[PDB]
Design an enzyme around this catalytic site. Structure first.
Site, short mmCIF file in Angstrom:
data_model
loop_
_atom_site.label_atom_id
_atom_site.label_comp_id
_atom_site.label_asym_id
_atom_site.label_seq_id
_atom_site.Cartn_x
_atom_site.Cartn_y
_atom_site.Cartn_z
N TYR A 1 9.71 -9.17 44.43
CA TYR A 1 10.38 -8.45 45.50
C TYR A 1 11.62 -7.74 44.99
O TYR A 1 11.95 -6.64 45.44
CB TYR A 1 10.80 -9.41 46.60
N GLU A 2 12.33 -8.40 44.07
CA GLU A 2 13.55 -7.80 43.50
C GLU A 2 13.19 -6.61 42.62
O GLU A 2 13.86 -5.56 42.67
CB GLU A 2 14.32 -8.89 42.72
N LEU A 3 12.11 -6.73 41.85
CA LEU A 3 11.60 -5.59 41.09
C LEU A 3 11.27 -4.42 42.00
O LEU A 3 11.69 -3.29 41.74
CB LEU A 3 10.35 -5.99 40.30
N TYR B 1 15.12 -9.17 50.60
CA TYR B 1 14.22 -8.43 49.72
C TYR B 1 12.85 -8.29 50.36
O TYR B 1 12.18 -7.27 50.20
CB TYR B 1 14.06 -9.14 48.39
N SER C 1 19.58 -9.20 37.10
CA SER C 1 18.54 -9.98 37.77
C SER C 1 17.76 -10.77 36.73
O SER C 1 17.47 -10.27 35.63
CB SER C 1 17.63 -9.04 38.56
#
Ligand SMILES: *SC[C@H](NC(=O)CC[C@H](N)C(=O)O)C(=O)NCC(=O)O
Ligand SMILES: *SC[C@H](NC(=O)CC[C@H](N)C(=O)O)C(=O)NCC(=O)O
Lengths: 142, 142
Positions: free
Chosen positions: B75-77, A75, B8
């Site tokens: 980071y995933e967002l 990520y 998530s």
């Protein structure tokens, strides 16, 4: 920019990164951003992922299989690829098996295929050159 | 797509997510992707972050302060924002203080400002509606 580099590295590589890379660079006068120390949860300025990269001249990745294979590191790679170009610096701490980087990291893949990285070595003589070349690349324009 | 949703959630919210959200959806026949179970380090197909989102109809985020304030969750967002649109589903498990989402997550910020999320409630009656509405939104077109 207030920082010379934002540094990203895997938990697996944390000891080496902190004891060799960060120690050397900070002893040598470079100003470094990295989340383990500088990310402050909930802080409106320091508690988001844009702060370090927006305020650093370079982004430096410590690469190894442990980095490439980690979900969280991927990520972070994605983010730098898409936000960050001359500002990217790759340090290969341990060799990456061929085609192990996911195919959609096409910029990182081109950089590795084009041999644009610095490679760590256990030999004193090569490490000496490594540190001089790392200082040089950190001072290049973007 | 083989999966109905990629999910998530923060480590802080893991117990609730696994015991209520994932259990309910999987008991109810939905097929779910999530990295804690389905990411396999080193696997050429299952060991990269593109697999789940490329193979799921929807991406569902479990949101709370613990999620928004986490470096890894941010980071995933970022990744979903930039890869993924009707495919995004936001579940608000705990209220987010106003302006706590970093300003550069402008799509997520617009979605929250536009009240396009489902909100968890401790009350049986509201939870019943919640689960029906969550099934409904998972079945909408993209
Ligand atoms: S590359 C992403 C992760 N790195 C770290 O955990 C280093 C420290 C963090 N930057 C921090 O705490 O701020 C990593 O290795 N991923 C964890 C995993 O094993 O998946
Ligand atoms: S939202 C990112 C992190 N979530 C998790 O750790 C949930 C499990 C993982 N998806 C997994 O192990 O695959 C998170 O909460 N960040 C860690 C932190 O506290 O910074």
């Amino acid at each position: 920019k207030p920082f010379d580099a934002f540094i990203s590295y895997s938990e697996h590589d944390a000891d080496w990164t902190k004891e060799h890379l960060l120690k050397k660079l900070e002893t040598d006068g470079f100003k470094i951003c990295y989340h383990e120390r500088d990310f402050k949860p909930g802080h409106p300025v320091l508690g988001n992922i844009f702060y370090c990269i927006e305020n650093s001249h370079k982004v430096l990745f410590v690469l190894s299989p442990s980095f490439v294979n980690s979900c969280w590191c991927q990520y972070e790679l994605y983010f730098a690829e898409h936000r960050v170009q001359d500002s990217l610096i790759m340090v290969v701490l341990e060799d990456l098996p061929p085609d192990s980087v996911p195919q959609k990291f096409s910029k990182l893949r081109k950089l590795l295929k084009r041999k644009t990285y610095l490679k760590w070595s256990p030999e004193e003589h090569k490490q000496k050159i490594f540190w001089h070349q790392l200082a040089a690349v950190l001072k290049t324009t973007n």
